[PDB]
Amino acid sequence: PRYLKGWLKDVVQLSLRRPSFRASRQRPIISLNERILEFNKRNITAIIAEYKRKSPSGLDVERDPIEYSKFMERYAVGLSILTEEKYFNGSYETLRKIASSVSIPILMKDFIVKESQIDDAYNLGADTVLLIVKILTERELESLLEYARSYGMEPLIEINDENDLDIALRIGARFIGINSRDLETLEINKENQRKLISMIPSNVVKVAESGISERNEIEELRKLGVNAFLIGSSLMRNPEKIKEFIL
Template sequence: MILDEIVQKTREELENRKKEYPLEWLGRSLAYNPYMPRDVKKALQSTPERPYRIIAEVKKASPSKGIIREDFEPVSIAKAYELGGADALSILTEPHYFKGNLEYITQVRRYVPMPLLRKDFIIDSYQILEALVYGADFILLIAAALKASELKELLEYARHLGLEVLVEIHNKEDLTKAIWAGADIIGINHRDLQTFEMHMNLCHELIPLIPQGKIIVAESGLSSPKTLEELHGIGVDAFLIGEHFMRQKDVTQALLDIYPLNKK
């Protein structure tokens, strides 16, 4: 199963990083950290003027599709997304399967004002501290990759550091974990991370089970204004879109096309 494989690779990589940059080193670096986490919930919540929000993804590759964008310049892509009206950015930092890098967060943070998500397979508090040090404003926690107790512990640690958390779910079991852990922002991923199969009805199945007051994010398989309007109609507040944008020559125009409200 690919999720298990990625998590195992992440554990191995993490042990190496901890030796090279001990936790104490990360902690000391916070004293020189110029970044204060930005207001993620405000960026993702619906308003009458802006009914739903877009988290645009900076993504070079994926395990299922290989290289998605050859001309990959994270800062240029981020600035193009800003011109298109993105509300937040998702930055892939997993190096082996998604060709990401933590440094991309720091590079992008210098040039764009919107909140940044560290999108990775986070299984340890060390990675959360890394996210803060490198300039992220919120992190992804994947319910399927964690025990309920682990999810709760990592979520609370992130909040302690001032970071928000997007908890990603794929089924009812994941949703139960997310609610028990205290998630405020819940991402429904249409892509099964074990098989990569798409389940585009998942929002319809899970949203009725989500308590009021949660910010709901739909992820994967999103490429048309009609789909976004339909899912917003059943309760989705924000959409995380990566592959569709990354395959377009002009990502600014692609964002404007999928969400006409962005046009000035």
């Protein structure tokens, strides 16, 4: 990985030492990016509901993962499950349970730095994974992208600045996530996010990430060309909001 400091340096060390998970895969892969595209054509707001009990910025919520997922399944285009253990309190078992309970696409959300984590995502039942440009070198990103594709997955490649975007475009990313939150400082910057969204080729599936809590925000982003929205905290605190965001 890249030179990192703070909590990011720590979470990456944890991922490097992450034990692989051996299991048989049941369901075939269900493409998340293709489902977003069809929701787009049916003019249905595409929301990727995320499940996370904790977060380094303060979230601490107790809510059943299965019930939450089964409820979200009625509305969401797909689910995002945190599997990072120390800061988000996620786990592989939680992902495994959920995957066995729902039939919509599942994105495994973690800090992927090695191929075995992608094997884990596939064996656990995930349909795609997140790759973060700012923690990986260009060569690592390119290898991991090809590796995920060998399982038939099109990973969501997350960018936070223009340099991340140059790299993502160079390696041929087709599914990009624009994170308004800077992972290093945990600061949110929606203007930088809006600026980046405007530079992305029209043929790539774009997902707005972080800090969304109101329908009007969704409406504004949609006019910028955003295809889908990844929402976690506001939905963890109030699952009912999914009904507001979707109409």
